């Protein structure tokens, strides 16, 4: 990244719904190279999400993830010998990458039984935008809203 501008590698889409978005979601959730376990958790959790909300699968996922995507985020500069937290507009791939990282991280924070219930309840708490990942999004937006004076 000093010199090398890069490409990006192409991920295989989801084997049940053909969604590369949800494929990157099972990669964000995966730990220790265990992909089967993570896709089992995602299929169970989103299956009970589709059963609970009654909408469908990945539009319930797409709504619950649409409520947690950040708009702008702070970022350090260190240009004039000072520490500024400037607000900067998030790229779309980074936008939903941060969305999924906050959903997954907040779901690991929860205190329910199984991971499919922690993440199904976290996506359900994000569908009416009252969970923890929405507090992370509102927190990011308070930081970039307080420091709006730098652009």
């Amino acid at each position: 990244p000093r010199r090398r501008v890069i490409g990006q590698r192409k991920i295989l889409p989801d084997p049940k719904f053909g969604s590369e978005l949800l494929a990157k979601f099972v990669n964000i959730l995966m730990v220790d190279g265990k992909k089967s376990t993570a896709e089992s958790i995602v299929y169970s959790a989103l299956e009970t999400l589709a059963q609970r909300s009654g909408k469908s699968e990945l539009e319930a996922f797409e709504v619950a993830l649409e409520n947690v995507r950040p708009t702008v985020e702070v970022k350090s500069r260190r240009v004039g010998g000072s520490t500024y937290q400037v607000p900067v507009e998030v790229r779309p791939v980074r936008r939903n990458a941060l969305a999924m990282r906050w959903i997954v991280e907040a779901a690991r924070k929860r205190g329910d039984k199984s991971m499919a219930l922690r993440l199904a309840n976290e996506l359900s708490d994000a569908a009416e935008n009252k969970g923890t990942a929405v507090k992370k999004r509102e927190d990011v937006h308070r930081m970039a809203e307080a420091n709006k004076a730098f652009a």
Partner: peptide, 12 residues
Amino acid sequence: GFRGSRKSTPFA
């Protein structure tokens, strides 16, 4: 609001 280094900006 924005007391200090932020009260001298075009935004303020």
